[PDB]
């Protein structure tokens, strides 16, 4: 996207979101990142929404095919699951490459740095979902390490009701439950996150209260499923 203006790439990313053209959206935001400037709060959201939708469709397809493959256990189901899996890993590697070159190293504010490290944890988590044994462990630790650094910063620098802090804790708890085989850690983190946000709600405006309580309900939904 080297010949397109940064502002035009951002404008077209917003258009693609409205048209539910998420592959286009991700390509526009990739081009915007590669212009080399830091991203605004809104721009970080556009980057995240685009790739979350792209990889979300790939993950859903991978699970359908993996289930068919398991039930069957010719080469076609395995071959096609491998194709989808390779395309998913390519998208994850692309996002991780953007974070590493050079979004994270240039992110100095708590809001931007925690946001990018949460992303890094998420896309290693998606790699971990399809990994089998070999570097499954190293991928899992890469996800853990990214989430952990984001957690440490968010606890130092953000209020307990901050939506990025809350969503980070939500996803790290899903990591514990689904990836790390640590359901007790998952439940403990979700509970402590919810209770500390509850106690800080009195400080919020009506609009911030709605933002925070929305994500708190997601934590509650998981606790209800897990206990």
């Amino acid at each position: 996207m080297g010949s397109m203006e940064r502002a035009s790439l951002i404008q077209k990313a917003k258009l693609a979101e409205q048209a539910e053209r998420y592959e286009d959206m991700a390509a526009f935001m990739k081009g915007a990142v590669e212009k080399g400037e830091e991203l605004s709060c809104e721009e970080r959201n556009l980057l995240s929404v685009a790739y979350k939708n792209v990889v979300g469709g790939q993950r859903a397809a991978w699970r359908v095919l993996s289930s068919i493959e398991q039930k069957s256990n010719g080469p076609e189901v395995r071959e096609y699951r491998e194709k989808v899996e390779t395309e998913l890993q390519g998208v994850c590697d692309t996002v991780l490459g953007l974070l590493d070159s050079h979004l994270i190293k240039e992110a100095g504010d708590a809001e931007s740095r925690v946001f990018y490290l949460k992303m890094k944890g998420d896309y290693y988590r998606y790699l971990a979902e399809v990994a089998t044994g070999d570097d499954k462990k190293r991928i899992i630790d890469s996800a853990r390490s990214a989430y952990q650094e984001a957690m440490d910063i968010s606890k130092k620098e953000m209020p307990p009701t901050n939506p990025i802090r809350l969503g980070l804790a939500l996803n790290f708890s899903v990591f514990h439950y689904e990836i790390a085989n640590s359901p007790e850690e998952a439940i403990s983190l979700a509970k402590t996150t919810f209770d500390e946000a509850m106690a800080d709600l009195h400080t919020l405006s009506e609009d911030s209260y709605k933002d925070s309580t929305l994500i708190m309900q997601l934590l509650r939904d998981n606790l209800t499923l897990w206990t």
Binding site: E17, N45, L46, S48, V49, K52, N53, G56, D122, G167, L170, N171, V174, Y177, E178, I215, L218, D221, N222, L225, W226
Partner: peptide, 9 residues
Amino acid sequence: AGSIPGRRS
């Protein structure tokens, strides 16, 4: 288990 839906913004 639901992660952040994060599909809309």
